[PDB]
Design a protein around this ligand. Structure first.
Ligand SMILES: Nc1ncnc2c1ncn2[C@@H]1O[C@H](CSCC[C@H](N)C(=O)O)[C@@H](O)[C@H]1O
Ligand SMILES: Nc1ncnc2c1ncn2[C@@H]1O[C@H](CSCC[C@H](N)C(=O)O)[C@@H](O)[C@H]1O
Ligand SMILES: COC1=C(C)C(=O)C2=C(C1=O)[C@@H](COC(N)=O)[C@@]1(OC)[C@H]3N[C@H]3CN21
Lengths: 278, 274
């Protein structure tokens, strides 16, 4: 339960960060700023494809259709959100704290001919500028991790969620006590990208506080963490002489995940909760 | 969290409780003692198939093939266990605390041609008579609720489970504080059947307290409890009216339909390794 100290991040500073590193940040991982998912560690499926997979299994738990209002916490550069709009015909209002993101994403929407179905705007998940009960579902795809007060953000979502709506999020967590051999690389990731791990036993009281019932906790670490890490550090270290223009000698080393393969009590989780009603 | 009084079962008393049930003909040969599971509240699958469906749902989570040794932690009349051995070819070893249960469990495996692959014995989960690291998987289908201490039963399962093996259980829990108009029927159910609820935040500690990382927590309440109690009540009521040719205090379980905060959980925890 924070056996390692944690960065305690500030949402507007988070925006400063993505503003910095969604620029040659797309040229390293690509368009989906979240983990990939594979059926077993041996899979040969490109990361491109496997990240879309996680979008999809999180989208599916939203349980939406054409003409569903959906809230995209932490919209990224637009790709997972534009995807849900194009594929499901639901309407997606998405929020980010970085200006450079909210622009790239309106653009993705605009180039998909879906600017009326998928609008992206600047707002703070700690203060949601939306009438109560104006969303059928909320997807927070690798977003809650950067945020200052989980208990409040969840309380914000529980307010906008119509009765019966469902919240689908990812988060980082301690599967059990940290191997000390690796508290380093996690102390470095967690700090260098302004994040925070949580205890699996936190979410239940955490969601009830927000007015939501847990529905599904799922440890997806064995399908998510390593194989991405092996590939992103490999993508990066195949052109580390391209830091000669990217400030990578100062910033891609913070992004290089190779130090995180193997950290076995380091945990990634899928979660779904439901506000009662409907 | 235990806002209602919760009784503390003795594992001897729950055996004495199921002894009386099993030989009353209630828990008869080939019947499941656990909730049915449906996908939609309007789904008209009959009771027997829904109950089999829960059994199958938990079984694949065990992730077993033929040649898997599976512990049936709290096995009743052996219906789920025999079916798991029959459909998987896994050697299943069930344990119960009710002697009159373990008897009819073995008889069911006998009638199936499975007496060699579906074995039952009288034993308390609190003290598993089994070597360390002996089981590829353990399933606790509606059992852990009767037991006197989860953190010990969990430690015991965690002992016998081989590294990599998995634990699948259902359990009761509080979705959210209990509503007054329904604190009544819940308090009666947990006393009359010697059962206890947990906080859902309880489990990841308890499981860690047994050297098991949780893998999957699943509130299945909206699929299980309501249709079952409806279906159960009609029988009880019909039976009473059929006995017109009197006794009218047996806690109609339909006193529980509508108590939306009362929860049914499905859990999958793993022991790291394999
Ligand atoms: N407090 C906050 N309020 C709103 N958005 C936030 C936030 N903290 C972090 N975010 C957003 O969370 C995102 C993390 S990256 C995830 C992006 C998107 N889910 C994708 O998968 O592509 C960033 O876009 C960042 O702006
Ligand atoms: N302390 C304990 N140790 C072992 N088994 C126990 C126990 N307390 C209760 N049980 C068993 O747990 C079961 C609860 S009823 C579930 C029976 C079985 N899953 C079925 O569906 O048919 C009974 O078999 C009961 O005997
Ligand atoms: C390899 O794919 C990525 C994984 C697995 C991450 O955990 C992760 C990102 C990725 O691209 C960053 C996005 O953007 C920048 N700067 O890389 C991010 O931290 C800033 C934001 N979602 C969080 C943490 N994190």
């Amino acid at each position: 339960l924070s056996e390692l100290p944690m960065p305690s991040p500030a949402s507007e500073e988070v925006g400063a960060l993505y503003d910095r590193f969604t620029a040659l940040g797309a040229a390293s991982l690509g368009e989906n700023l979240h983990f990939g998912y594979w059926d077993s560690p041996d899979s040969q499926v490109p990361l491109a494809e496997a990240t879309d997979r996680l979008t999809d299994m999180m989208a599916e738990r939203l349980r939406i259709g054409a003409g569903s209002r959906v809230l995209d916490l932490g919209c990224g550069v637009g790709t997972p959100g534009v995807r849900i709009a194009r594929l499901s015909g639901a309407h997606v209002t998405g929020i980010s704290v970085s200006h450079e993101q909210v622009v790239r994403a309106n653009a993705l929407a605009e180039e998909a001919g879906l600017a009326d179905r998928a609008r992206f705007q600047r707002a703070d998940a700690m203060d949601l500028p939306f009438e109560d009960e104006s969303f059928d579902a909320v997807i927070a795809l690798e977003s809650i991790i950067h945020m200052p007060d989980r208990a409040q953000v969840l309380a914000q979502v529980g307010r906008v969620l119509r009765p019966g709506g469902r919240l689908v999020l990812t988060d980082f967590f301690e599967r059990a006590p940290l191997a000390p051999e690796g508290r380093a690389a996690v102390q470095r990731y967690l700090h260098d990208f302004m994040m925070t791990m949580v205890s699996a036993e936190a979410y239940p009281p955490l969601l009830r506080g927000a007015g939501l019932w847990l529905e599904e906790f799922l440890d997806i670490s064995d399908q998510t963490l390593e194989k991405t890490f092996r590939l992103l550090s490999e993508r990066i270290n195949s052109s580390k002489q391209r830091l000669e223009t990217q400030f990578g000698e100062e910033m891609v080393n913070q992004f290089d995940p190779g130090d995180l393969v193997g950290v076995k009590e380091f945990g990634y989780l899928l979660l779904v909760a439901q506000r009662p009603g409907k």
